[PDB]
């Protein structure tokens, strides 16, 4: 492989260059609110983000080597997690707001629209506030996001492929530690922060499962229609 032959600094650069762009929505601040329309916007946005995520996953070291079937499974399991941690990261500098798009900020109050969505908003807001108090760095973010991609579906796999995935996961771990060592953190502070970061992934999994149930609810409901791609990602769960 080529992932294990990478230094920590090179690992960061590869992930940092592979970052997807921040997409805009078709939001109109003349149009007031709703709940069919908001979900319509969020569905349109998430569907376009998925296309970039899929091509982003290709540029994640190690993901290329995996079987097509393995790649499909990993994305099917973690796609909402990756969307959320991206959303949370974009919203760090906007307390009480969830920057879905530069032209779509939204509020906890606007989460009351759509039954059950307000609870998920609070959890996303709490995650963003956590990232803010930890002063999460961009280099640490791209590490965590790539960890989610490889780890979320690794426990649902003749195959020495799971061993190669854990090897890459160990490399990303070394990369995270390398970064914290640069920031002047003590050896004790490196362990604590590493733990703090990975424990957040447990809550991101929780939000994803909650969000997955919410999306399945609006699917069996007569409105709003989901994209053909989202329905495939949703049926995977």
């Amino acid at each position: 492989s080529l992932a294990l032959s990478l230094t920590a600094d090179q690992m960061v650069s590869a992930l940092l260059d592979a970052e997807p762009p921040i997409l805009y929505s078709e939001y109109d601040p003349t149009r007031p609110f709703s709940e069919a329309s908001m979900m319509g916007l969020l569905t349109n946005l998430a569907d376009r983000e998925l296309v970039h995520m899929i091509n982003w996953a290709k540029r994640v070291p190690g993901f290329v080597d995996l079987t097509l079937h393995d790649q499909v499974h990993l994305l099917e399991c973690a796609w909402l997690e990756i969307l959320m941690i991206g959303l949370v990261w974009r919203s760090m500098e906007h307390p009480g707001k969830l920057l879905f798009a530069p032209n779509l900020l939204l509020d906890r109050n606007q989460g009351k629209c759509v039954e059950g969505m307000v609870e998920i908003f609070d959890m996303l807001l709490a995650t963003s506030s956590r990232f803010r108090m930890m002063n999460l760095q961009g280099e640490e973010f791209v590490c965590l996001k790539s960890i989610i991609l490889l780890n979320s579906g690794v426990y649902t796999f003749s195959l020495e492929e799971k061993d190669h995935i854990h090897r890459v996961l160990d490399k990303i771990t070394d990369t995270l530690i390398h970064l914290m060592a640069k920031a002047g953190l003590t050896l004790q502070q490196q362990h604590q922060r590493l733990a703090q970061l990975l424990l957040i992934l447990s809550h991101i999994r929780h939000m994803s499962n909650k969000g997955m149930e919410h999306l399945y609810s609006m699917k069996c409901k007569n409105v709003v229609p989901l994209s053909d791609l989202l329905l495939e990602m949703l049926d995977a769960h």
Partner: peptide, 9 residues
């Protein structure tokens, strides 16, 4: 399989 397509550029 839309996901399978996009993974195959």
């Amino acid at each position: 399989k839309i996901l399978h397509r996009l993974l195959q550029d």
